[PDB]
């Protein structure tokens, strides 16, 4: 639906449990364990192995064409490695415990540039509607209970067309930006 991926930085590991505790106060059933994985290449391009879409592969660029491809798309990359530079620097995978709250599907996990685990990522995908930017007002007030005093003002992924489909693809663009900041610093 519509999501606001962000990072909320001592005791980084303790932050997830404390942050989860704040989520637990609201009350959300543990309905699974999400696992989002990112891969990196030279010419660049990223393939985002995302959870909750077991088939989709979500190949993407910095700002350009994005295609949704089934799980077999990965087999092309490994076999196509000859002409490209596969697994160029490091693969960043963020796995966390899914906390779906009364149709909000809000999840928080520690991003682990294997095995460092230096960051925290919050997934707040709001399933109901695809219309996102002219509907952004809803997500903020859900956030304000979850996190404290540092709500992300806007995700910035929205180009604000007259009629706006969002879908799942542009979320992976949002994930990349969070990963870009994590990779850039520490």
């Amino acid at each position: 639906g519509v999501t606001c991926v962000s990072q909320m930085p001592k005791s980084v590991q303790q932050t997830v449990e404390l942050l989860t505790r704040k989520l637990e106060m609201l009350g959300a059933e543990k309905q699974g364990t999400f696992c989002v994985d990112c891969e990196t290449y030279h010419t660049l391009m990223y393939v985002m192995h995302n959870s909750e879409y077991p088939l989709s592969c979500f190949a993407l660029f910095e700002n350009g064409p994005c295609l949704i491809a089934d799980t077999n798309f990965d087999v092309l990359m490994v076999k196509l490695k000859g002409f490209f530079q596969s697994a160029k620097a490091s693969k960043i995978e963020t796995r966390g415990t899914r906390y779906q709250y009364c149709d909000f599907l809000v999840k928080v996990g520690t991003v682990t540039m294997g095995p460092s685990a230096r960051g925290i990522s919050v997934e707040v995908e709001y399933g109901p509607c695809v219309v996102a930017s002219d509907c952004w007002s809803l997500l903020l007030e859900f956030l304000q209970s979850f996190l404290g005093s540092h709500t992300p003002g806007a995700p910035a992924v929205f180009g604000n067309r007259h009629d706006a489909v969002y879908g799942p693809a542009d979320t992976m663009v949002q994930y990349m930006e969070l990963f870009n900041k994590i990779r850039k610093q520490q």
């Binding site: 088939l55 989709s56 089934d70 799980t71 799942p168």
Partner: protein, 306 residues
Amino acid sequence: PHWQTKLEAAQNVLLCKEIFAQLSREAVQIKSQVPHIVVKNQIISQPFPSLQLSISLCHSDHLYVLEHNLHLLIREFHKQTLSSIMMPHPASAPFGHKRMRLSGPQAFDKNEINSLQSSEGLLEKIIKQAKHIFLRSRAAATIDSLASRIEDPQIQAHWSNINDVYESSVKVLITSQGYEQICKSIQLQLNIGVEQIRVVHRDGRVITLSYQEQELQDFLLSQMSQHQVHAVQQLAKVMGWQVLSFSNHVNASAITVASPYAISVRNGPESGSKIMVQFPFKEVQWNKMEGRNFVYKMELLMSALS
């Protein structure tokens, strides 16, 4: 053609033998919180506490809505193979459920894809139906019976013309004796689910429900006393009388009506009591007061006081 009819009977038997085999394997192999029993040719099962399903192949009570559905339901299972959906609109692609092949590459969710693949086979698709075919009867007979038993207000049921298996739609218009226009009041859309019924009340309240017949009958009776109280309010709006304190709930509802000497009334499912106030009050009993039915007697009483 004599040879034709002889062959047709054989084909029906071979198909029928398959149907029982499909049920018979499914019943014991898998469990769905129900104690299926297997006998020579009878697969005895207990979908409800008060129901017994005798799906019994008979070689040489009959609903014929459940029986026929087996023959047709099997074909859908047979159809799922070697169908036109399997083949890919793109010439080059592996054979696969068309809706499935477009699901993976279009980023469908973890839950929807799992739900589609979780088809229940045969026995669950019929037990759940018989789990609704008769739950409908227990909710249909009660509504039919309730109209005859209680004559004071008139239950009215407008049954929907499109009620597919696993669901049925209801209309309920609880109006008094004949005062349809002056007094139109609570009308609930009851929904007959597979396991439990579902109603949505007139005012907006939603009641999930129980599955037992007795629980439904109680709900209508509780809504019974509520309407008679609402009849007071509707008359207050249209009669020269003016409203006073209202108490929609507490089961029993009590309403008070002002007059330009007031009558304040408490009608629960077991109370049905009402009063005249003068100026300190005394009870009123209808068994001696006005005639046909409740609202007319209530309307006349107000036309007797003012």
